[PDB]
Amino acid sequence: SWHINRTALNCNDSLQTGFITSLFYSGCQNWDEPHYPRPCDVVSARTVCGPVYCFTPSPVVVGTTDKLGIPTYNWGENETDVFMLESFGCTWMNSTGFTKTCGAPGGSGPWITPRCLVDYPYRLWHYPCTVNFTLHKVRMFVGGIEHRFDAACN
């Protein structure tokens, strides 16, 4: 049920860093060691810049909804739009350029171990320190369901 209109586009480069370039077109700041992940909750879409990804472990995009879980198609403009993350591990860019994560696929966000993470289309924007990582095919079973995804590792 995903649509491109369900992408929160609420970016505010108030620190004047130019971080938004890789959303269209070096180091991972405020590094979060994968171990002991924080729990996923409800994220206000007004704080989100660009696509939200979760990792089941396979990568899946999460779109804006209202606070009762109904898909919304306003590019995150409505200040009641949210991402209901609890409904495994997820990551997104917040409006001022900070990469945020919750949960795990211990792991954190897309990271499996401190040296490997799930590949997805916005990996290098969310984690620029992984530009030179190598990619490996992975297969994993979670409760009988088969996952096939690429992993990027150092």
Epitope: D13, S14, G18, I20, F24
Partner: antibody, heavy 124, light 109 residues
Framework: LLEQSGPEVKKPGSSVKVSCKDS??????VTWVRQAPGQGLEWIGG????????KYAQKFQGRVIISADASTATAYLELSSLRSEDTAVYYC?????????????????????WGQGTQVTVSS | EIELTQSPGTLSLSPGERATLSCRAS???????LAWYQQKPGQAPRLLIY???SRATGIPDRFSGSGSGTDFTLTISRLEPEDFAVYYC?????????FGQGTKVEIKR
């Protein structure tokens, strides 16, 4: 550099499509403004080509369409239902990325670079 | 809609003189979101100042901007011949982004 299409001449009630080609920042936000003869500048609308989200000023809503073509790195402005009041120079310009503000896909910042402008004349 | 009022309409000054242009906003604008542009006949506008007081890339030292709230000023400390043109202010903090009506800086003789 942004290269805009050449001048256009149109009868009332027709449509016109002007283009804005850049030569490596295509998916960066593009904003259209117009300048009526002897007037200042007026926001028409814009697009973020990476996602396709468009925004329009109320005075052009339902009467214009902005689009972008990723293969040719070109953005487009289509105005429909033309009247003589639409005679103007139409400018394309890039929204600056550093310090940009986006709300619901509406991108605003200083504007640079600029296209050279496209003259559209609407007349019987 | 935020209206931008520029004064004077026309400024007549000799080359080498200091020029002061004003732009009055109908409502308060954050200084982060005000820019100045230069336009010469038949040409596209050219960004000069952004964020009220930051000079765009390639813009000479003699252009400076200042102001806050509802009153912003563009200053050209010493007019060169290539500086005589039309100048527009722009607010891009609140949609719709709006432009002032322009000040023409004219050669006094």
């Amino acid at each position: 550099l942004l290269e805009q299409s050449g001048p256009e001449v149109k009868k009332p009630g027709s449509s016109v499509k002007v283009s804005c080609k850049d030569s490596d920042t295509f998916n960066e936000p593009v904003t259209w403004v117009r300048q009526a003869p002897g007037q200042g500048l007026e926001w028409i609308g814009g697009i973020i080509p990476a996602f396709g989200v468009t925004k329009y000023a109320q005075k052009f809503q339902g009467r214009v369409i902005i689009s972008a073509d990723a293969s040719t790195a070109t953005a487009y402005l289509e105005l429909s239902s033309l009247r003589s009041e639409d005679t103007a120079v139409y400018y394309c310009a890039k929204v600056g990325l550093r310090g940009i503000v986006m709300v619901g896909g509406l991108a605003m910042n200083w504007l640079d670079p600029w296209g050279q402008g496209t003259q559209v004349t609407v007349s019987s | 809609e935020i209206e931008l009022t520029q004064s004077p309409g026309t400024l007549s000054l000799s080359p080498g003189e200091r020029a002061t242009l004003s732009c009055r906003a109908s409502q308060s604008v954050s200084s982060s979101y005000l820019a100045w542009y230069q336009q010469k006949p038949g040409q596209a506008p050219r960004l000069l100042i952004y964020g009220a007081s930051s000079r765009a890339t390639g813009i000479p030292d003699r252009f400076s901007g200042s102001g806050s709230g509802t009153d912003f000023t563009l200053t050209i400390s010493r007019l060169e011949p290539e500086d005589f043109a039309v100048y527009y202010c722009q607010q891009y903090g609140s949609s719709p982004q709006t432009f002032g009506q322009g000040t023409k800086v004219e050669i006094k003789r």
